[PDB]
């Protein structure tokens, strides 16, 4: 068995416990979950209007999942260096170790400062994620379905940029499942598609098209952390890693 | 006002005609085992309206639901009419398997025979049977994907063909009343998949 | 959801905590420390020799 | 004592009769007849093998048979002679689909031997103005008696206990049939000691007594359906279903 | 009568109650009224001055009713997609079920 | 009764509308009117909004969006049950079409 | 503590492991590994329908798989990746005979949904002078993870708990696999909400670690056989077997 230990061959004298730095730094670290609650970058984008968006329109959408979005290096023309360089990040890295999770997520989106416009945010649990592809931010365009617009019944909240340009969301767990998949999701069962993301967050400005131009190419960082209630389940060993300092230099 | 308080109300949902001549194998209906049972109106409008059982309507506001349903059956018939009919319930039918059905395969799954003679009405109670503790909404906001179909399907075949006296009509009206079962319940609130008839107006965004 | 109809408080904002003060005064901060209540601790071998 | 007050609901009380997922009912009181006292389990005496009833599925009612009964049928006229355990399978085979398809009947596909009591309900929707009557009669090991062809008449069966079905009351005929047979067990398939007459117990049979009678313009015919619970059973002799073979067509 | 039940034909084994998701999601939903208290879009407009309005002037007005305003798809030229598409909304939808209100 | 938000402080007012009618309780379905009195018997009243901006400044405000929200404010009580009028399915709604 | 005294009987003690009519044994002590704490029954939450385990037949061991393991097999070499509930049926289908034929598997022919814990024994007769080792590793929902192909290597599985089989000791590897899945139930057939990946739970897999090694003239190969008990199960969603369809060939 994996954890069996046939025969210890101790040489060590007892070593004093640090209590995980509690002895020194005054704080324990053994509880990985509390570390999990520190926020992490979740995504990044420049706003990019396409159609003359109506106020109804969501500016963009994304699946809301612990695993982290499929990593975005960005284009060769426009690398997102932080993923290009600072690969992945902690929370997904630990997510690598488990096959299931149940619980919530925090986000705390940061809007560009320069704009004043009021900002709404839908949550749509209804949406199924579909394939690990498109586990990512998406810029909605011309309205067709109700997907591209603000929607009624879905829970939502509206930050006022003029008051403040950073919303602090909390995403409830809502699935008719025991608990969701945690590794990268290839899909299979049509039902299985519902069984991953907590749902689908979406964001839209109330700005009219005449004003919307100011908002173009503005940065929008997103963060997240597991929101206390989160619970990973089944252990799984790690997939192979890629060393970061081993990454190539930009080269002169 | 309360979810159950509404859900515990029958609405007429269907009006089967049941003639004498129907074969013992003959089907009467096979509506799905979901709250979102339909009743289309002959709206000439491009957006046809539909009747719903109250339970379906209240269900429409929620992503998920679970628990038993109920179908009161009212066989509007004189006592002299006599007949018998299965009202079975097949769990887990995909639409390809929606066909191939007969009352007999239906018998393989759970079912209830009934004998029309004296009492002319009863109430079947549809089981909730799914791999899923809840069940996703059949439809959704105008957004076709993420519109999973019903877990299972009801059936009703004429287990014994009607045998009317000559002095009474061969046809017999049957009515079907949906209602939320006592077990019935929903959970997550989302955009209702329905609109009021108050303003059945719509605007296509053709670009032409 | 009762409405809270009662009157709102009525302060005066200021952009910064005092600098010159440095005594009997809790001084709020954004600690980069992970623990909410953690604090530097001196190991008995690392004890502050000098008052 | 009277005072009818028919409602939208109708009027009369309805008896239930739940088993497993199957449930079925009648307005009328059943005309039960019980040929024998309930059987002892007998596994004790003839099976080391794992032995089990599958009441969760075996006890479901199922429609072994159905048929028209027209007025045209002469007085002493059989409508059916159902060898029972066979016909439960023979019927499904008549539906031209495998025994495994029906939840009631799968264990037979596997187990070699079987024992257990049977139940038979014989529902009917004869119109009230229709008049006639059918007797129903179980008869053990009918096949083994060569002279049965002589006895096989209403006068014959009448002497032993038997259910009755007036066309007039459209009465249901319930019918207990506790297991009895020379040997304690019935094989589900060909067996080293015997093959022929597999899974027989004798037959239920429904000789007509009074033919339907009516105003000439009245509803000429009638219909009958038969269900069969299979209660306190026991299965044994685990085996591949491949050994199992289709029932004789009868 | 509507709610009468002539004769139950149970097949069901008892099914465990979710307590309306209280068992899972940690919150009940059976109480429709609390759901009613979640906010809903009630209207939408672009401000449109006509007369050189004096400070006294109300910019605009509307009736204040639970039922929801008569639905505004908007012009064919300028649909308000949310009503054009996301028809109505919850609160009016429930308002559909009753003939009176107070509050 | 009235209230004044300061946009510079904040651009979202949070109103509460009291029930005031000389009625037991108001109509709830779409209201065709009939009795002249019946006209009072529906809306809680009539909200209205005005900027203090002068016409020279008012131009900035043109074609600016103004969303409005609402919820029933706890004290609300629906009364008599009525069955639903026929519905229109939403995902059944036509596509914009290319 | 020692003093061997081999007899005509041999010498060492033999463990038993009875279930139903099936019984099987090993000389060696099993190398158990248990991925998860035992599952709660969960029928409570999602089935009005009659629900029943058929432990009398479901719990029988059965040979889902077997294979040679030659020395020729390179270090990190899978010998098998058994999606389990599927392979129990897929194997029988590989025997080119109906699911109904095997007593273990009949209810699946009927019931739509299923839940329940699995047990897997992996017996072997490697000769003592043969040297090598195989790890066995269950992996939930393996299919759902697209990156699994990367992980699917001994280094990968080694990190999670896993059974071991020395060629030398010819050790048996016992393996509890309690049910866990995103949804509480696995359908036995196509279902309105999903079809694809039917009756999957992920897969057991047996990457080789140490390849067989021996004197060149020694017994070149080895053999492995796998049985699977299916204990605290539950079946539900009664249905005609006609709805049931053959498992994907894999």
Please give the Cα distance from D137 to D52 (Å, whole number): 29
Residue of B180, B186, B79, B95 whose CA lies nearest to B137: B186
Contacts of B185 in chain A (CB under 8 A): none
Most G CBs within 10 A among D47, D104, D241, hence the mutation to make, goes to D241
Residue D88 near residue D105, CB atoms below 8 Å:
yes
D186 forms bridges with which residues in the sheet? D114
A62 forms bridges with which residues in the sheet? A201
Please give the Cα distance from G70 to G79 (Å, whole number): 10
Please give the Cα distance from A242 to A60 (Å, whole number): 31
Residue B165 near residue D128, CB atoms below 8 Å:
yes
Buried b (16+ CB within 10 A) or exposed e, G197-212: bbbbbbbbbbbbbebb
Record the tokens describing residue A194, joined without a space: 């519902």
Q: Indicate the SS3 state at residue D18.
A: strand
- Cβ-based contacts under 8 A for chains A and F: 28
Range of the structural domain that residue G182 is part of: 1-250
Q: How far is CA D168 from CA B82, B124, D130, D213, E19, in A?
A: 12, 28, 6, 10, 51
Tell whether E82 lies on the interface with A, counting CB pairs under 8 A: yes
Please give the Cα distance from E35 to E32 (Å, whole number): 5
Tell me if F28 and E87 make a contact (CB, 8 A cut-off): no
Which residues lie below 8 Å from residue G63, measured CB to CB, with a gap of 6+? G91, G225, G226, G227
Tell me if A162 and F11 make a contact (CB, 8 A cut-off): yes
Q: How far is CA C32 from CA C17, C29, C35, C39, C42, in A?
A: 18, 9, 9, 11, 19
Tell me if A206 and F65 make a contact (CB, 8 A cut-off): yes
Please give the Cα distance from B158 to B171 (Å, whole number): 13
Nearest-Cα distance to chain C for A24, in Å, is: 5
Resolution in A: 3.5
Record the tokens describing residue B78, joined without a space: 């004189």
G56 vs D50, D106, D242: nearest CB: D50
Contacts of E89 in chain B (CB under 8 A): 192
Tell me the backbone φ, ψ of residue B55, rounded to 5 degrees: -65, -35
Buried b (16+ CB within 10 A) or exposed e, A56-92: bbbbbbbbbbbbbbeebeeeeeeebeebeeebbbebb
Half-sphere exposure of D227 (CA within 13 A, CB side): 31
Tell me whether strands B152-154 and B185-186 are parallel, antiparallel or unpaired.
unpaired
Contacts 24+ apart (CB under 8 A), D41-44: D41/D232, D41/D234, D42/D115, D42/D184, D42/D185, D42/D234, D43/D115, D43/D234, D43/D236
DSSP class per residue in G128-161: TT-B-EEEEEEEETGGGBTTHHHH-SHHHHHHS-
Nearest-Cα distance to chain D for E16, in Å, is: 18
Please give the Cα distance from F93 to A147 (Å, whole number): 13
Q: Indicate the SS3 state at residue G31.
A: coil
**G:153-182 residues touching chain A, CB 8 A cutoff:** 155-164, 180-182
Residue D85 near residue D187, CB atoms below 8 Å:
no
G140 forms bridges with which residues in the sheet? G202
Tell me if E25 and A153 make a contact (CB, 8 A cut-off): no
Q: Are there at least 3 beta-carbon pairs closer than 8 Å between C and D? A: no
Residue of A175, A161, A177, A159 whose CA lies nearest to A114: A161
Method: cryo-EM
Tell whether A149 lies on the interface with E, counting CB pairs under 8 A: yes
Which residues lie below 8 Å from residue A69, measured CB to CB, with a gap of 6+? A42, A43, A62, A63, A135, A136, A137
Tell whether A155 lies on the interface with F, counting CB pairs under 8 A: no
List chains adjacent to chain C, taking adjacency as at least 3 C-beta pairs closer than 8 Å. Answer: A, F
Contacts of E24 in chain G (CB under 8 A): none
Contacts of A148 in chain E (CB under 8 A): 81
Percent helix, percent strand, percent coil in chain C, to nearest 5? 5, 0, 95
Tell me the backbone φ, ψ of residue B9, rounded to 5 degrees: -140, 120
Q: Indicate the SS3 state at residue F41.
A: coil
Tell me whether strands B121-126 and E8-9 are parallel, antiparallel or unpaired.
parallel
Q: How far is CA B164 from CA B28, B86, D219, in A?
A: 18, 19, 7
Contacts of B54 in chain E (CB under 8 A): 97
Tell me whether strands B89-91 and D233-236 are parallel, antiparallel or unpaired.
unpaired
Please give the Cα distance from B77 to B83 (Å, whole number): 10
Tell me if D56 and G57 make a contact (CB, 8 A cut-off): no
Tell me if B119 and E38 make a contact (CB, 8 A cut-off): no
Tell me if D6 and B112 make a contact (CB, 8 A cut-off): no
Tell whether E81 lies on the interface with A, counting CB pairs under 8 A: yes
Nearest-Cα distance to chain B for D48, in Å, is: 32
Buried b (16+ CB within 10 A) or exposed e, G35-67: bbeeeeebbebbbbbbbbbbbbbbbbbbebbee
Please give the Cα distance from E2 to D149 (Å, whole number): 58
Please give the Cα distance from G199 to A18 (Å, whole number): 48
Which DSSP letter does residue B21 get? Answer: T
The C-alpha angle E96, E99, E100, rounded to 5 degrees, equals: 115
DSSP class per residue in A47-89: ----S---TTB-SEEEE--TT-PSP--B-SSSB-HHHHTS-S-
Please give the Cα distance from D214 to G25 (Å, whole number): 74
Residue A225 near residue A40, CB atoms below 8 Å:
yes
Looking at the structure of chain G, the number of domains it has is: 1
Q: How far is CA A202 from CA A59, A148, B147, in A?
A: 8, 9, 19
Q: Indicate the SS3 state at residue F40.
A: helix
Residue G49 near residue G238, CB atoms below 8 Å:
yes
Residue of D247, D173, D155 whose CA lies nearest to D209: D155
Q: Any idea where the domains of chain A sit in the sequence?
A: 1-252
Is residue E64 within a helix (H) or strand (E), and if so which, with residue range? none
Q: Indicate the SS3 state at residue G84.
A: helix
Q: Indicate the SS3 state at residue E102.
A: strand
Tell whether G205 lies on the interface with A, counting CB pairs under 8 A: no
Tell whether E60 lies on the interface with F, counting CB pairs under 8 A: yes
E9 vs D8, D10, D23: nearest CB: D23
Contacts of E28 in chain A (CB under 8 A): none
**What residue in C sits closest to A31 (Cα-Cα)?**
C35
Q: Are there at least 3 beta-carbon pairs closer than 8 Å between B and E? A: yes
Record the tokens describing residue A86, joined without a space: 């600072």
Contacts of D60 in chain E (CB under 8 A): none
**Greatest C-alpha distance within chain F:** 54
Contacts of B117 in chain D (CB under 8 A): 12, 27-28, 125, 170
Contacts of B136 in chain A (CB under 8 A): 176, 194
Tell me the backbone φ, ψ of residue E94, rounded to 5 degrees: -85, -30
Half-sphere exposure of D148 (CA within 13 A, CB side): 15
Residue of B199, F84, B7, B1 whose CA lies nearest to E102: B1
Alpha helices in B22-164 (DSSP H): 54-59, 103-108
Q: How far is CA G96 from CA B186, G85, G104, G244, in A?
A: 45, 17, 16, 16
Tell whether B141 lies on the interface with F, counting CB pairs under 8 A: yes
Residue matched to tokens 């001196």:
C42
Tell whether F67 lies on the interface with E, counting CB pairs under 8 A: yes
Contacts of E15 in chain G (CB under 8 A): 44-48
Tell me whether strands B121-126 and A180-181 are parallel, antiparallel or unpaired.
unpaired
C35 vs A23, A24, A27: nearest CB: A27
Please give the Cα distance from A43 to F11 (Å, whole number): 29
**D:10-39 residues touching chain E, CB 8 A cutoff:** 10, 14, 16, 18, 21-23, 25
Please give the Cα distance from A133 to A184 (Å, whole number): 9
Please give the Cα distance from A145 to D15 (Å, whole number): 52
Nearest-Cα distance to chain A for G137, in Å, is: 10
Cite the beta strand spans of G27-151 per DSSP E: 63-68, 77-83, 113-116, 118-124, 133-140
Chain-centroid distance, C-alpha E16: 30
DSSP class per residue in D60-124: S--EEEEEE--TTS-SSEEEEEEEHHHHHHHHHHHTTS-GGGSTTTHHHHH-SEEEE-EEEEEEE
G112 vs B92, B105, B149: nearest CB: B92
Residue matched to tokens 């000098």:
C50
Percent helix, percent strand, percent coil in chain F, to nearest 5? 10, 15, 70
Tell me the backbone φ, ψ of residue D229, rounded to 5 degrees: -75, 155
Please give the Cα distance from G241 to G99 (Å, whole number): 10
Nearest-Cα distance to chain D for G21, in Å, is: 6
Q: What is the dihedral of CA B23, B29, B30, B34, to 10 degrees?
A: -150
Residue of D171, D177, D227, D164 whose CA lies nearest to D23: D227
Which residues lie below 8 Å from residue B87, measured CB to CB, with a gap of 6+? B71, B73, B111, B112, B114, B124, B154, B155, B156
Tell whether E3 lies on the interface with G, counting CB pairs under 8 A: no
Tell me if B164 and D21 make a contact (CB, 8 A cut-off): no
B84 vs D125, D130, D217: nearest CB: D125
Cite the beta strand spans of chain A per DSSP E: 40-43, 60-63, 100-102, 105-106, 118-123, 156-160, 170-171, 180-181, 200-205, 222-224, 231-232
């Amino acid at each position: 068995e994996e954890s069996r230990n046939t025969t210890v061959l101790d040489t060590t004298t007892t070593l004093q416990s640090s209590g995980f730095g509690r002895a020194f730094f005054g704080e324990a670290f053994n509880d990985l979950k509390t570390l999990m609650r520190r926020y992490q970058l979740y995504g990044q984008l420049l706003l990019s209007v396409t159609t003359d968006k109506d106020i109804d329109h969501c500016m963009f959408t994304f699946p809301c999942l612990p695993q982290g979005l499929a990593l975005d290096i960005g284009s060769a023309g426009s690398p997102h260096e932080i993923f290009n360089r600072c690969r992945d990040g902690i929370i997904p890295l630990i997510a690598s170790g488990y096959r299931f999770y149940r619980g919530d997520l925090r986000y705390k989106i940061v809007f560009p400062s320069n704009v004043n416009s009021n900002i709404w945010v839908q949550h749509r649990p209804d949406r199924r994620l579909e394939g690990w592809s498109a586990a990512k931010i998406v810029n909605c365009d011309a309205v067709s379905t109700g997907q591209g617009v603000y929607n009624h019944g879905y829970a939502s909240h509206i930050q006022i940029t003029r008051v403040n340009n950073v919303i602090e969301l909390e995403v409830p767990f809502y699935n008719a499942t025991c608990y969701n998949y945690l590794q990268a999701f290839n899909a299979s069962s049509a039902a299985s598609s519902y069984a991953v993301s907590l749902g689908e967050i979406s964001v839209g400005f109330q700005a009219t098209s005449d004003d919307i131009a100011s908002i173009v190419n503005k940065p929008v960082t997103i963060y997240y952390s597991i929101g206390d209630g989160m619970q990973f389940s089944q252990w799984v060993g790690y997939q192979p890693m890629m060393i970061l300092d081993q990454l190539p230099a930009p080269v002169v | 006002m309360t979810v159950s308080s509404i859900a515990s109300r029958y609405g007429l949902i269907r009006r089967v005609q049941w003639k004498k001549d129907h074969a013992k194998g003959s089907l009467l209906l096979q509506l799905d085992a979901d709250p979102f049972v339909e009743q289309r109106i002959e709206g000439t409008n491009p957006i046809s309206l539909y009747w719903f059982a109250p339970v379906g309507v209240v269900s429409s506001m929620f992503m998920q639901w679970r628990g038993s349903l109920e179908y009161r059956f009212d066989i509007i018939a004189s006592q002299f009419h006599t007949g018998r009919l299965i009202v079975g319930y097949v769990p887990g039918l995909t639409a390809s398997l929606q066909l191939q059905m007969d009352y007999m395969k239906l018998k393989s799954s759970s079912y209830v025979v009934f004998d029309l003679q004296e009492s002319n009405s009863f109430t079947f109670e549809v089981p909730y049977v799914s791999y899923r503790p809840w069940w996703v909404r059949k439809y959704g906001g105008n957004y076709l994907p993420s519109s999973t179909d019903a877990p299972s399907t009801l059936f009703m075949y004429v287990q014994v063909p009607l045998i009317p006296m000559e002095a009474v009509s061969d046809t017999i009206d049957i009515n079907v009343y949906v209602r939320g079962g006592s077990s019935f319940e929903v959970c997550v609130p989302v955009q209702p998949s329905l609109g009021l008839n108050w303003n059945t107006d719509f605007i296509l965004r053709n670009d032409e | 959801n009762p409405s809270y109809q009662q009157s709102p408080r009525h302060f005066v904002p200021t952009g910064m905590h005092s600098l010159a003060l440095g005594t009997n005064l809790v001084e709020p901060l954004h600690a980069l420390r992970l623990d909410a209540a953690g604090t530097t601790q001196h190991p008995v071998g690392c004890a502050p020799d000098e008052d | 004592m009277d005072n009818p007050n028919p409602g939208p609901d109708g009027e009369g009380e309805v008896e239930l009769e739940k088993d497993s997922n199957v449930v079925l009912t009648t307005q009328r009181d059943p005309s039960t007849s019980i040929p024998a006292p309930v059987s002892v389990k007998w596994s004790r005496w003839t099976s080391n093998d794992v032995v089990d009833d599958y009441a969760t599925i075996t006890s479901r009612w199922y429609q072994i048979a159905e048929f028209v009964w027209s007025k045209d049928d002469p007085f002493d006229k059989e409508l059916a002679r159902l060898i029972l355990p066979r016909a439960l399978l023979s019927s499904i085979e008549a539906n031209s689909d495998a025994i495994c398809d029906v939840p009631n009947t799968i264990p037979f596909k596997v187990h070699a031997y079987w024992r257990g009591d049977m139940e038979v309900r014989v529902q009917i929707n004869s119109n009230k103005f229709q008049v006639g009557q059918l007797q129903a009669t179980w008869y053990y090991s009918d096949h083994e008696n060569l002279n049965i062809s002589s006895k096989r008449s209403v006068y014959g069966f009448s002497q032993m206990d038997h259910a009755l079905i007036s066309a007039s009351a459209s009465n249901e005929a319930k019918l207990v049939i506790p297991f009895k047979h020379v040997y304690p067990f019935l094989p589900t398939r060909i067996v080293p000691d015997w093959t022929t007459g597999i899974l027989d117990m004798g037959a239920l049979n429904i000789r007509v007594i009074a033919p339907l009678r009516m105003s000439a313009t009245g509803p000429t015919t009638c219909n009958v359906v038969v269900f069969i619970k299979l209660n306190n059973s026991e299965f044994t002799g685990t085996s591949s279903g491949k050994f199992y073979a289709s029932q004789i067509r009868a």
